């Protein structure tokens, strides 16, 4: 059981490295979709001032 728990814990550490490699993609992909709304928000700087 100690040989199995320690086998699972490096597998648990293997999925931790699997975890943040997806999360570091999600921060990037959120930005371009947010950047789609910056240029939408920057239009309202001129349209409302008209």
């Amino acid at each position: 059981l100690g040989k199995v728990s320690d086998k699972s814990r490096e597998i648990s550490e293997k999925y931790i490295e699997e975890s943040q490699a997806i999360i570091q993609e999600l921060v990037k992909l959120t930005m371009e979709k947010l950047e789609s709304k910056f240029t939408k928000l920057c239009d309202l700087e001129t349209q409302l001032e008209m």
Binding site: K3, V4, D6, K7
Partner: peptide, 26 residues
């Protein structure tokens, strides 16, 4: 060509070691 009795016709008629060797190490 004589018929035969019906109760006579009814009368005539690696995967282990792949898991064990993995179970001894961990």
């Amino acid at each position: 060509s004589l018929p035969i009795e019906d109760n006579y016709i009814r009368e005539v008629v690696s995967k282990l070691m792949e898991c064990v060797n993995d179970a001894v190490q961990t």
